[PDB]
Design a protein around this motif. Structure first.
Motif, PDB file in Angstrom:
ATOM      1  N   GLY B  11       0.797  -1.208   0.000  1.00  0.00           N
ATOM      2  CA  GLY B  11       0.000   0.000   0.000  1.00  0.00           C
ATOM      3  C   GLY B  11       0.834   1.265   0.000  1.00  0.00           C
ATOM      4  N   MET B  12       1.918   1.277   0.773  1.00  0.00           N
ATOM      5  CA  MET B  12       2.709   2.494   0.775  1.00  0.00           C
ATOM      6  C   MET B  12       3.493   2.671  -0.531  1.00  0.00           C
ATOM      7  N   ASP B  13       3.918   1.570  -1.186  1.00  0.00           N
ATOM      8  CA  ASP B  13       4.545   1.720  -2.503  1.00  0.00           C
ATOM      9  C   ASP B  13       3.583   2.331  -3.507  1.00  0.00           C
ATOM     10  N   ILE B  14       2.325   1.903  -3.494  1.00  0.00           N
ATOM     11  CA  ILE B  14       1.344   2.491  -4.406  1.00  0.00           C
ATOM     12  C   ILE B  14       1.128   3.965  -4.084  1.00  0.00           C
ATOM     13  N   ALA B  15       0.958   4.260  -2.800  1.00  0.00           N
ATOM     14  CA  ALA B  15       0.749   5.647  -2.396  1.00  0.00           C
ATOM     15  C   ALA B  15       1.950   6.521  -2.773  1.00  0.00           C
ATOM     16  N   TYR B  16       3.162   5.990  -2.605  1.00  0.00           N
ATOM     17  CA  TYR B  16       4.336   6.748  -3.004  1.00  0.00           C
ATOM     18  C   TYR B  16       4.386   6.984  -4.509  1.00  0.00           C
ATOM     19  N   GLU B  17       4.091   5.958  -5.309  1.00  0.00           N
ATOM     20  CA  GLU B  17       4.075   6.174  -6.744  1.00  0.00           C
ATOM     21  C   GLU B  17       3.051   7.252  -7.112  1.00  0.00           C
ATOM     22  N   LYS B  24       5.416  14.922 -10.607  1.00  0.00           N
ATOM     23  CA  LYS B  24       5.702  15.103 -12.033  1.00  0.00           C
ATOM     24  C   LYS B  24       4.701  16.047 -12.687  1.00  0.00           C
ATOM     25  N   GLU B  25       3.446  15.964 -12.277  1.00  0.00           N
ATOM     26  CA  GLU B  25       2.381  16.787 -12.829  1.00  0.00           C
ATOM     27  C   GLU B  25       2.401  18.215 -12.312  1.00  0.00           C
ATOM     28  N   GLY B  26       3.333  18.582 -11.463  1.00  0.00           N
ATOM     29  CA  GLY B  26       3.390  19.916 -10.893  1.00  0.00           C
ATOM     30  C   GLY B  26       2.569  20.120  -9.648  1.00  0.00           C
ATOM     31  N   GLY B  27       2.033  19.069  -9.066  1.00  0.00           N
ATOM     32  CA  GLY B  27       1.228  19.162  -7.871  1.00  0.00           C
ATOM     33  C   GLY B  27       1.944  18.873  -6.552  1.00  0.00           C
ATOM     34  N   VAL B  28       1.139  18.912  -5.490  1.00  0.00           N
ATOM     35  CA  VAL B  28       1.615  18.573  -4.146  1.00  0.00           C
ATOM     36  C   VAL B  28       1.834  17.062  -4.095  1.00  0.00           C
ATOM     37  N   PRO B  29       3.038  16.583  -3.705  1.00  0.00           N
ATOM     38  CA  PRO B  29       3.356  15.143  -3.838  1.00  0.00           C
ATOM     39  C   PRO B  29       2.859  14.353  -2.643  1.00  0.00           C
ATOM     40  N   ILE B  30       1.549  14.152  -2.638  1.00  0.00           N
ATOM     41  CA  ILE B  30       0.854  13.405  -1.597  1.00  0.00           C
ATOM     42  C   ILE B  30      -0.051  12.377  -2.276  1.00  0.00           C
ATOM     43  N   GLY B  31       0.170  11.094  -1.984  1.00  0.00           N
ATOM     44  CA  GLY B  31      -0.536  10.024  -2.653  1.00  0.00           C
ATOM     45  C   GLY B  31      -1.203   9.088  -1.668  1.00  0.00           C
ATOM     46  N   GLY B  32      -2.097   8.258  -2.203  1.00  0.00           N
ATOM     47  CA  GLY B  32      -2.858   7.333  -1.377  1.00  0.00           C
ATOM     48  C   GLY B  32      -3.368   6.139  -2.151  1.00  0.00           C
ATOM     49  N   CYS B  33      -3.822   5.142  -1.400  1.00  0.00           N
ATOM     50  CA  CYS B  33      -4.605   4.044  -1.957  1.00  0.00           C
ATOM     51  C   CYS B  33      -5.484   3.447  -0.869  1.00  0.00           C
ATOM     52  N   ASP B  39      -8.285  -9.441   1.059  1.00  0.00           N
ATOM     53  CA  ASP B  39      -7.563 -10.081  -0.028  1.00  0.00           C
ATOM     54  C   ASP B  39      -6.496  -9.210  -0.662  1.00  0.00           C
ATOM     55  N   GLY B  40      -6.257  -8.006  -0.127  1.00  0.00           N
ATOM     56  CA  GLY B  40      -5.259  -7.104  -0.637  1.00  0.00           C
ATOM     57  C   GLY B  40      -5.625  -6.400  -1.915  1.00  0.00           C
ATOM     58  N   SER B  41      -6.874  -6.514  -2.371  1.00  0.00           N
ATOM     59  CA  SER B  41      -7.279  -5.866  -3.607  1.00  0.00           C
ATOM     60  C   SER B  41      -7.229  -4.367  -3.411  1.00  0.00           C
ATOM     61  N   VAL B  42      -6.809  -3.651  -4.441  1.00  0.00           N
ATOM     62  CA  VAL B  42      -6.710  -2.196  -4.427  1.00  0.00           C
ATOM     63  C   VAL B  42      -8.027  -1.664  -4.969  1.00  0.00           C
ATOM     64  N   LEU B  43      -8.796  -0.988  -4.096  1.00  0.00           N
ATOM     65  CA  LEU B  43     -10.071  -0.384  -4.517  1.00  0.00           C
ATOM     66  C   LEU B  43      -9.844   0.879  -5.351  1.00  0.00           C
ATOM     67  N   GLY B  44      -8.735   1.581  -5.146  1.00  0.00           N
ATOM     68  CA  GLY B  44      -8.466   2.818  -5.863  1.00  0.00           C
ATOM     69  C   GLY B  44      -7.175   3.423  -5.340  1.00  0.00           C
ATOM     70  N   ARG B  45      -6.628   4.347  -6.122  1.00  0.00           N
ATOM     71  CA  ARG B  45      -5.425   5.081  -5.746  1.00  0.00           C
ATOM     72  C   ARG B  45      -5.571   6.502  -6.247  1.00  0.00           C
ATOM     73  N   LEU B  81      -6.693   2.683   4.512  1.00  0.00           N
ATOM     74  CA  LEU B  81      -6.297   3.805   3.696  1.00  0.00           C
ATOM     75  C   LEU B  81      -4.823   4.068   3.958  1.00  0.00           C
ATOM     76  N   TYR B  82      -4.032   4.029   2.882  1.00  0.00           N
ATOM     77  CA  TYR B  82      -2.631   4.381   2.902  1.00  0.00           C
ATOM     78  C   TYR B  82      -2.524   5.820   2.438  1.00  0.00           C
ATOM     79  N   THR B  83      -1.808   6.645   3.179  1.00  0.00           N
ATOM     80  CA  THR B  83      -1.529   8.024   2.790  1.00  0.00           C
ATOM     81  C   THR B  83      -0.045   8.332   3.017  1.00  0.00           C
ATOM     82  N   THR B  84       0.600   8.967   2.042  1.00  0.00           N
ATOM     83  CA  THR B  84       2.034   9.253   2.225  1.00  0.00           C
ATOM     84  C   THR B  84       2.281  10.285   3.325  1.00  0.00           C
TER      85      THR B  84
END
Ligand SMILES: O=C1NC=C[C@@H](O)N1
Ligand SMILES: O=C1NC=C[C@@H](O)N1
Ligand SMILES: [Zn+2]
Ligand SMILES: [Zn+2]
Lengths: 166, 164
Positions: B11-17, B24-33, B39-45, B81-84
């Protein structure tokens, strides 16, 4: 505010217009607006967009804030947020994060979260108007579309408990 | 707890990506999933969309939830919820409103609000993993664009504040 509260009828009337529009659109009938207390200017206005946009986050209050656009942090410190319904924990958190000092609420009969009190614990003013137009429209939605309503407030539907209670 | 925490590196690797993509897009570098603990399924990121969309509400956590789509209330009750970055009061409120039981936080060195504790007061689990990648990207953004960062947490930069 003695001066800030002067805008309260204007703000709740706009918030109700937004709720009624959302209702017409097949959505959750919850509306809002953000007013600059200095001059009564409407910074933005909105309604819940869950149905219209397939949105898990655009409650009426969030949609209102989104519609004001990006603003310098200082602007929010002298605003009132008007919401037709007492805010959930998410919308409460938005008011707190931005430092919006006043939240004026149409009604807290159809719904109230721990956020109404938490706002006040955190130093924000809450006033409940008890606006019957808001109460009627929201009660109609909750009565007719409870499954959609529970979705909008993140509540797990527990029918076994409800069957035992009734 | 074991079944949920087994996903925390994923989860934290996804949030970091997501954070890095926002950078890269010029935004605030804060990510989540948001992950289903069963079952470890990712509902969204997602990532913060303030600059990309002119958005006052799409913090990383909010955008993550938006990107999961409409979900019935039961779904959220067994997710993480994973948040960077440790959540502000708004994103804290979203986690509480949906009943998401676990929040795994990349770091709380560049930012923390009262929400981190309020989550625990309200019965949610908070784990801070002190991810060095998250700390460095956020520190980089804050150093280059401090006014923009302050706009994201609704605060004005003022010399009086740091001057006692
Ligand atoms: O749109 C909304 N839905 C539920 C409660 C309130 O915060 N607003
Ligand atoms: O995107 C975000 N910005 C600030 C704090 C955190 O909640 N997330
Ligand atoms: Zn809400
Ligand atoms: Zn946030």
């Amino acid at each position: 505010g003695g001066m800030a509260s002067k805008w309260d009828q204007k703000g709740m009337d706009i918030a109700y217009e937004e709720a009624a529009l959302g209702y017409k659109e097949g959505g959750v009938p919850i509306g809002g607006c953000l007013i600059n207390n200095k001059d009564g200017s409407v910074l933005g206005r909105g309604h819940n967009m869950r149905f219209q946009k397939g949105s898990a986050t655009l409650h009426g209050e969030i949609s209102t804030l989104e519609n004001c656009g990006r603003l310098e942090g200082k602007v929010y410190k002298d605003t009132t947020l008007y919401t037709t319904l007492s805010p959930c924990d998410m919308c409460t958190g938005a008011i707190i994060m931005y430092g919006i000092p006043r939240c004026v609420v149409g009604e807290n009969v159809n719904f109230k979260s721990k956020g109404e009190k938490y706002l006040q614990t955190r130093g924000h003013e809450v006033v409940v108007v008890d606006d019957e137009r808001c109460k009627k429209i929201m009660k109609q939605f909750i009565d007719e579309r409870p499954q959609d309503w529970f979705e909008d407030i993140g509540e797990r539907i527990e029918l076994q408990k409800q069957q035992e209670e009734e």
